[PDB]
Enzyme design. Sequence first.
Site, mmCIF file in Angstrom:
data_model
loop_
_atom_site.group_PDB
_atom_site.id
_atom_site.type_symbol
_atom_site.label_atom_id
_atom_site.label_comp_id
_atom_site.label_asym_id
_atom_site.label_seq_id
_atom_site.Cartn_x
_atom_site.Cartn_y
_atom_site.Cartn_z
ATOM 1 C CD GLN A 105 -7.566 14.279 13.690
ATOM 2 O OE1 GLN A 105 -8.699 14.737 13.546
ATOM 3 N NE2 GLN A 105 -7.294 13.306 14.551
ATOM 4 C CG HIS A 163 -21.279 10.850 26.034
ATOM 5 N ND1 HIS A 163 -20.956 12.159 26.313
ATOM 6 C CD2 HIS A 163 -20.348 10.410 25.153
ATOM 7 C CE1 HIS A 163 -19.873 12.498 25.632
ATOM 8 N NE2 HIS A 163 -19.485 11.453 24.922
ATOM 9 C CG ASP A 164 -17.339 9.545 26.768
ATOM 10 O OD1 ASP A 164 -17.527 8.331 26.546
ATOM 11 O OD2 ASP A 164 -16.966 10.355 25.888
ATOM 12 C CG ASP A 184 -19.083 11.011 21.292
ATOM 13 O OD1 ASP A 184 -18.344 11.657 22.068
ATOM 14 O OD2 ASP A 184 -19.122 9.766 21.275
ATOM 15 C CG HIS A 212 -15.516 14.505 25.306
ATOM 16 N ND1 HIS A 212 -15.693 14.812 23.973
ATOM 17 C CD2 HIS A 212 -16.111 13.304 25.497
ATOM 18 C CE1 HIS A 212 -16.368 13.839 23.386
ATOM 19 N NE2 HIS A 212 -16.632 12.913 24.288
ATOM 20 C CG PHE A 261 -11.272 11.069 12.695
ATOM 21 C CD1 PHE A 261 -12.085 10.009 13.070
ATOM 22 C CD2 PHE A 261 -11.396 12.278 13.370
ATOM 23 C CE1 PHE A 261 -13.005 10.148 14.114
ATOM 24 C CE2 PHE A 261 -12.311 12.429 14.413
ATOM 25 C CZ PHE A 261 -13.112 11.362 14.784
ATOM 26 C CG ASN A 264 -13.713 16.981 19.061
ATOM 27 O OD1 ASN A 264 -13.034 16.107 19.590
ATOM 28 N ND2 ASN A 264 -14.720 17.587 19.689
ATOM 29 C CG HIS A 287 -12.759 9.885 26.279
ATOM 30 N ND1 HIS A 287 -11.746 9.356 25.506
ATOM 31 C CD2 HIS A 287 -13.858 9.922 25.485
ATOM 32 C CE1 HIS A 287 -12.211 9.093 24.295
ATOM 33 N NE2 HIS A 287 -13.489 9.427 24.257
HETATM 34 O O1 LIG Z 1 -13.120 4.438 21.524
HETATM 35 C C1 LIG Z 1 -13.758 5.513 21.543
HETATM 36 O O2 LIG Z 1 -14.851 5.659 22.130
HETATM 37 C C2 LIG Z 1 -13.221 6.589 20.863
HETATM 38 C C3 LIG Z 1 -12.060 6.414 20.119
HETATM 39 C C4 LIG Z 1 -11.525 7.477 19.401
HETATM 40 C C5 LIG Z 1 -12.140 8.725 19.419
HETATM 41 C C6 LIG Z 1 -11.581 9.754 18.666
HETATM 42 C C7 LIG Z 1 -11.824 11.094 18.952
HETATM 43 C C8 LIG Z 1 -11.168 12.072 18.211
HETATM 44 C C9 LIG Z 1 -11.363 13.423 18.473
HETATM 45 C C10 LIG Z 1 -10.669 14.359 17.715
HETATM 46 C C11 LIG Z 1 -9.801 13.920 16.719
HETATM 47 N N1 LIG Z 1 -9.634 12.630 16.491
HETATM 48 C C12 LIG Z 1 -10.288 11.699 17.202
HETATM 49 C C13 LIG Z 1 -10.089 10.346 16.950
HETATM 50 C C14 LIG Z 1 -9.252 9.919 15.924
HETATM 51 C C15 LIG Z 1 -7.961 10.419 15.802
HETATM 52 C C16 LIG Z 1 -7.132 9.961 14.784
HETATM 53 C C17 LIG Z 1 -7.591 9.003 13.888
HETATM 54 C C18 LIG Z 1 -8.882 8.500 14.010
HETATM 55 N N2 LIG Z 1 -9.322 7.573 13.162
HETATM 56 O O3 LIG Z 1 -10.441 7.127 13.277
HETATM 57 O O4 LIG Z 1 -8.603 7.171 12.275
HETATM 58 C C19 LIG Z 1 -9.710 8.960 15.027
HETATM 59 N N3 LIG Z 1 -10.732 9.425 17.681
HETATM 60 C C20 LIG Z 1 -13.300 8.901 20.167
HETATM 61 C C21 LIG Z 1 -13.837 7.837 20.886
HETATM 62 MG MG LIG Z 2 -17.708 7.217 24.729
HETATM 63 ZN ZN LIG Z 3 -17.570 10.933 23.963
#
Ligand SMILES: O=C(O)c1ccc(-c2cc3cccnc3c(-c3cccc([N+](=O)[O-])c3)n2)cc1
Ligand SMILES: [Mg+2]
Ligand SMILES: [Zn+2]
Lengths: 326, 325
Positions: free
Chosen positions: A284, A115-116, A233, A79, A287, A236, A75
């Site tokens: 991932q 935004h961040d 957002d 980003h 996700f 990625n 962040h």
């Molecule tokens: O609290 C927040 O605002 C927040 C939390 C997590 C992410 C985020 C970004 C990623 C970017 C690239 C790959 N992965 C990202 C992940 C992520 C990574 C591993 C697992 C998961 N998931 O949701 O299970 C999410 N999370 C962004 C914002």
């Molecule tokens: Mg944010």
């Molecule tokens: Zn962001």
Amino acid sequence: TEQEDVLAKELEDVNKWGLHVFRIAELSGNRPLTVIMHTIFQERDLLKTFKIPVDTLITYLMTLEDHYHADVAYHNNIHAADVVQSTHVLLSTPALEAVFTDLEILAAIFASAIHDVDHPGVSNQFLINTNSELALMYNDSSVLENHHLAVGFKLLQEENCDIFQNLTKKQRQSLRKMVIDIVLATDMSKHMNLLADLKTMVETKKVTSSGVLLLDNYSDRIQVLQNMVHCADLSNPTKPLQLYRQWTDRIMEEFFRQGDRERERGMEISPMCDKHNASVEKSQVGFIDYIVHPLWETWADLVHPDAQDILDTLEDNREWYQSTIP
Amino acid sequence: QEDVLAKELEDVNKWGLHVFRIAELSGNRPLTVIMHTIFQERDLLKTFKIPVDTLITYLMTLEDHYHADVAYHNNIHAADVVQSTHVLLSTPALEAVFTDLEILAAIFASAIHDVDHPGVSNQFLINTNSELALMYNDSSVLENHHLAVGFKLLQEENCDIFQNLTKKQRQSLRKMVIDIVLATDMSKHMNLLADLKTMVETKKVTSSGVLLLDNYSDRIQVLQNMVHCADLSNPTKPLQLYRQWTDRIMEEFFRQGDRERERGMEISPMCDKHNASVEKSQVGFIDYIVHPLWETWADLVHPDAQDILDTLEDNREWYQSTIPQ
Ligand SMILES: O=C(O)c1ccc(-c2cc3cccnc3c(-c3cccc([N+](=O)[O-])c3)n2)cc1
Ligand SMILES: [Mg+2]
Ligand SMILES: [Zn+2]
Ligand SMILES: O=C(O)c1ccc(-c2cc3cccnc3c(-c3cccc([N+](=O)[O-])c3)n2)cc1
Ligand SMILES: [Mg+2]
Ligand SMILES: [Zn+2]
């Protein structure tokens, strides 16, 4: 002046998905947000349209970029620059040609840029659970997002930083409201509701005689902008693999650092924040399957077939990460 | 004086308490003495193991953060809302609906609900690009601030009255208090009333006629509307008290209206002293806001809110009578 020409060459891809933002960050002396925002404003002729003094724009951008933490792995200013540029490309999608006004365009891009800002590298839940000053200030509701907005707007008051000095009072009022609506929608806890509404819009979608999306009310217009920035957002996994993997490396580092703080506090480690029990590849795939693909599949439908290639890349990347599991 | 004060406090469980007298008799400490009396009346100090000294220290610090130069939104109004909520919680129709923690939340919320109020509205703070509006992104600006101050004060020396609550209780209490105070934002009135009506047309009661609220969602909704009703209870109190409350809100409004005029802003309704109709405004306030709300609440706890709804209608008749033909 040679490195400057190399940077200019890279900035030529500002209208393309998969721009190499990390390279631009290096070539610009760690000023990706400033150079990309400046490039986009010139590209969209926003300085002329809103009578924004060039020196004022550069001063605000450098100040804004300065307020992103250079010591946070994910962040940070790179980003922010990435979300700005991604939103910029999404705004240019054929299905949205001539749909949004210049002010709405300005709002979406400005929102993306701030935004961040001043993100500490830990989640809202962590801030809430540790009785942080930020959570106390914002009553545990969209803690970080409220803060990003407060900082983004407050910086406009610094010396020669008010880039909106020549907008009418009504324009400033409208822009501020739209920016707030957009940034608050980036709170990840609101993802499901945001997606639910986007799906409802696709199911009841209407197009003009020109073939573009028909948005005749603030509610629908702001909803599309909120989802657009949310998609940016969460873009990625839709980018070329060499970019996606770097983003994954960065967010995992950020997660692990938070996990170390939670462990050192006797707190239960948040999901995917435990470096001693992490499954990066499986995480991932999860996700993508539960969050990213559902969202992008829906956006793709709203602007079909404009985002087909973006969706194809996401599916290919999902396949790749999955292949590293067996 | 303490005998007179202690004497007045004997009616703490009654609608129409002489809150102004209590303020004068307590050396302008209505919030502290009324809160203390209520915690005992409800035996909350024992139930939640709250130290008496800690309670007093916090209450005084909290009361100190209400502005004495603000005509309406001061410590007397806070004390009045606390006492009013305290009475509404005793509505027979709600005898066994709320837990002790929920009771605690509604009362604490009432106490801090307007702390550090500057005497001007959210709209004024927004239109003037105030630091408060910038901090809270024009959304429930004052209400977010009242909560922030209310909770922050708990961190002052010997001010954590929730020090003995369990981790889960504190977390639950904080959530409910936030949900309740944010609901006092006047711009949310219509939405809150709507939800209240829905609960009425889908209400469920028992033998004794007690309301049956199973879902937390509905329970918090009632507490939100309850504190909101207390916030808007001035017109339902004895006329002598109501008139004093009206004088105060009008004084606060006029002071703001001048600022909107001194800055060339569109003077907010009823804030123009050179162009105001106090009496007509009160009747309108009652007809479009207060009565609709209390009528709906009356149906929810039917018919225990009849004496209150009666006083309101009587006061409405009196104010109307002060308007010449
Ligand atoms: O609290 C927040 O605002 C927040 C939390 C997590 C992410 C985020 C970004 C990623 C970017 C690239 C790959 N992965 C990202 C992940 C992520 C990574 C591993 C697992 C998961 N998931 O949701 O299970 C999410 N999370 C962004 C914002
Ligand atoms: Mg944010
Ligand atoms: Zn962001
Ligand atoms: O912005 C806020 O948070 C706020 C604004 C106004 C009131 C208020 C209180 C009154 C108390 C006693 C009699 N009247 C009160 C009025 C009021 C007075 C005259 C007319 C109206 N009205 O709504 O038409 C309202 N307004 C409270 C809170
Ligand atoms: Mg209030
Ligand atoms: Zn109040």
